[PDB]
Design a binder for these strands. Sequence first.
DNA 1: TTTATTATTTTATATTATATAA
DNA 2: TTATATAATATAAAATAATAAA
DNA 3: TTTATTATTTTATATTATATAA
DNA 4: TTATATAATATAAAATAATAAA
Lengths: 155, 156
Amino acid sequence: KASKRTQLRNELIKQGPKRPTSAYFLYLQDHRSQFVKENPTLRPAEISKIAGEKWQNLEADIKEKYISERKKLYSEYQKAKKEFDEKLPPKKPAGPFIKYANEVRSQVFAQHPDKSQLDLMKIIGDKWQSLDQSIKDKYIQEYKKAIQEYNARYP
Amino acid sequence: KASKRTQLRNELIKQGPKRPTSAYFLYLQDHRSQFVKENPTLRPAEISKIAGEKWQNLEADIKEKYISERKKLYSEYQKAKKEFDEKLPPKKPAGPFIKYANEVRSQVFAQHPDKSQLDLMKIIGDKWQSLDQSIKDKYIQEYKKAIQEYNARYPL
DNA sequence: TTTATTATTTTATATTATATAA
DNA sequence: TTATATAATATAAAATAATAAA
DNA sequence: TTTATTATTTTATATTATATAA
DNA sequence: TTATATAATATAAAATAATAAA
């Protein structure tokens, strides 16, 4: 259940740029009217089933075109997505354990090549548990500066 | 997920007058700081219970004082709802079968005094199925004039 | 909750590169 | 990480909500 | 989805006449 | 109809969401 700030982001992200239409769908729009002219008898659900197999069928010249147009459209979206996401309110600084895990995950993975990252996180948890206090405090004190700057920057 | 004209009503309904609080809560808000000072150790939930026990054993002359106040506030709330509900857009006109059910409900219930509203409606639903077509048209024609008038007074 | 009619909403479909859920 | 939702759309047909009274 | 810490959120509780759900 | 939710409050305390990276 999202909290007040995640609702805001979620609501803010929702008004962000939307993913571009599928490459097929661009081809569908062009031959949608023709296709209705091809057949008024069949259901709209039937419409898309027959139309679907047209797309597989198209010669590469026309097909690829659409695909390429989708590539170009997606690229325009992804630029907007990066600039949109950078501008929106920042999440809170990660906690002491997270920063620690982030520093040692690389060595812990090399010492456990078989383990998935979920098991790495379990491992790093017990590593954090066994950490000396003084070492933990370094992460805890470091977090204090983190939210301190975060609170002074964003009061 | 509901019809649009209806959806405007629902958003309007939420702005409507809210029902007043109980008589216990009037008494609680009046004596809340007193209980905590009498019971500084007790948790928030613990003090609510202390207040309830005080409420159960409260002098009845003062206890009725809140009851009567609560009665004053609920009347105000009631008058607000009437005036508020009369001002909001109207509900859709009832279906043909519904008006039939209402007209014939009295008679059907006398035939079956051992039946709940739910059961009686199944009986009345069987009666509508066998109802004459000329009779069924009467309600159906009546309903059409109602929604058509409804749409005129409450256009989308 | 029940009922029947009707006004209104959801679904059914195609495609996939990735954003997102987890 | 892997598994799943999403982006676009037309539109018949299928699903359901509205409605009253107890 | 996993981890620990930390921030945020819900709950624990009294009452009870009616309104609302079903 | 019957069965459950509701209106109000405090605010400690218990619960849970945020938080990265894969």
